[PDB]
């Protein structure tokens, strides 16, 4: 297990998008994990559709929230998920318009990472790929993030409310970190990405909901 | 295990091509198997490049012959294979021009089917997908094939010289068969396909070299 990894450099990460006024953060995270795994299994980087998840995952809340595990389960039981080109993101709720002919990726279940265990998360990122996680984004310090390794002892490490995609880890000037891909556009953070305090005892609760799809 | 299957109907089979004046039959077979498996793993049907195999598999003979297993091993160790669009078929030998950025499929080893065991071949086709095989095509009866279930007791069930892709099995008017995809264009056989005598004691030696890739 490497001391550093950046899946952005391995071509596992799709360009940063903006979820707009819609709680589809879980959709982008799930789509990102499935994209990374699709890349790992095929070698082809292909933008999958979070909108498909928003509309067709009937056990999530569409633009009102949801989980990544439920999305993976959806992709598995439905027998596929559409590409971004075939099923574009519009940022609002609508009926399920899944085109099975536009099928571009499949799933075979999911795996959850043991709560509180950042070691298992690092091992996962190392051996699996971009891991779908969820953190506490409510703090203005996160809203105003722009550079460095993010940390705040006020950050809730127990209650969690925002899905992002861990695309690697490393260290910047002594401070260990998680590289996270957010869905608030390139106008937020470091062009859509952020560095999060690693090994600071589950900072922002990055291990409360860490999951990844199988292919 | 079904009594019949047609992967052409499941959208696992790429349109029939013509290998021209080049012994790249093994390339089309391997590419076909990898295409079927790529479809099974992703749900996307994508034409892979036999030319890539012809040029880059250095343990085969290019347009002079080769094995499918060696091709699978190539795709595995090289870490990918190009699409047909990126690496078109030209029907002649040339240098390896593999574009790793054009990577569209990967492999993780291969499996050979026990020689003489058509049962294991049927089970394979059922549980895996289109199986790369090789048969005896030398007979004029095969060259002039057009309809029915092909059979000839003069067909060599021991010595084998032509790679095709078993894309399913079934029965036509009492006679059990293997659906095979050849690479002699749509101007041969049933628009490029043929039905081969099944359970006629390894007819044309269809189990002498039956193999499939893993993904
Ligand atoms: C479904 O999606 C495919 C994606 O390639 C598209 O080509 C086709 O026009 C669509 N057809 C239907 C059934 O709406
Ligand atoms: C390699 O292939 C890719 C396939 O998309 C193509 O876009 C690119 O122009 C090629 N580049 C090189 C290194 O020749």
Curated annotation (Swiss-Prot), chains A, B:
The active site is at 25, 162, 182. GO terms for biological process: bone resorption; collagen catabolic process; negative regulation of cartilage development; proteolysis involved in protein catabolic process; thyroid hormone generation. It catalyses: Broad proteolytic activity. With small-molecule substrates and inhibitors, the major determinant of specificity is P2, which is preferably Leu, Met > Phe, and not Arg. Thiol protease involved in osteoclastic bone resorption. Displays potent endoprotease activity against fibrinogen at acid pH. May play an important role in extracellular matrix degradation. Involved in the release of thyroid hormone thyroxine (T4) by limited proteolysis of TG/thyroglobulin in the thyroid follicle lumen. It is found in: Lysosome; Secreted; Apical cell membrane. Disulfide bonds join 22-63, 56-96, 155-204. Predominantly expressed in bones. Expressed in thyroid epithelial cells. Its main location: other. Disruption phenotype: Enlarged thyroid follicles, reduced extension of the thyroid epithelium, and slight increase in the levels of Tg/thyroglobulin in the thyroid follicles. Loss of localization of CTSB/cathepsin B and L to the apical membrane of thyroid epithelial cells. Serum levels of thyroid hormone thyroxine (T4) are normal. However, reduction in T4 levels is more severe in CTSK and CTSL double knockout mice compared to CTSL double knockout mice. It is an enzyme of class 3 (hydrolase). Its EC number is 3.4.22.38. The keyword Phosphoprotein does not apply. It comes from Mus musculus. Belongs to the peptidase C1 family. The chain holds residues 115 to 329 of 329 of the full protein. Keywords: Cell membrane, Disulfide bond, Glycoprotein, Hydrolase, Lysosome, Membrane, Protease, Secreted, Signal, Thiol protease, Zymogen. Glycans are attached at residue 99. One of its GO terms (molecular function) is collagen binding. The gene is Ctsk. This is Cathepsin K. It comes from the Eukaryota. It is a peripheral membrane protein. One of its GO terms (cellular component) is nucleoplasm.
């Amino acid at each position: 297990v490497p001391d550093s990894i950046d899946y952005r450099k391995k071509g596992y990460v799709t360009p940063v998008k903006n979820q707009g006024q819609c709680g589809s953060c879980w959709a982008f995270s799930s789509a990102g994990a499935l994209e990374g795994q699709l890349k790992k299994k095929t070698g082809k980087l292909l933008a999958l559709s979070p909108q498909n998840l928003v509309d067709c995952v009937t056990e999530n809340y569409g633009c009102g929230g949801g989980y990544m595990t439920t999305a993976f389960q959806y992709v598995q039981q439905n027998g596929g998920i559409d590409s971004e080109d075939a099923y574009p993101y519009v940022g609002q709720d609508e009926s399920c318009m899944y085109n099975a002919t536009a099928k571009a990726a499949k799933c075979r279940g999911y795996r959850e990472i043991p709560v509180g265990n950042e070691k298992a998360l690092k091992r996962a990122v190392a051996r699996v790929g971009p891991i779908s996680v969820s953190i506490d984004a409510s703090l203005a310090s996160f809203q105003f993030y722009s550079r460095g390794v993010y940390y705040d002892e006020n950050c809730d490490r127990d209650n969690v409310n925002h899905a992002v995609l861990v695309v690697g880890y490393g260290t910047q000037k002594g401070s260990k970190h998680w590289i996270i891909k957010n869905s608030w556009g390139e106008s937020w953070g470091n062009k859509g990405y952020a560095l999060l305090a690693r090994n600071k005892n589950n900072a922002c609760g990055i291990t409360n909901m860490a999951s990844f799809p199988k292919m």
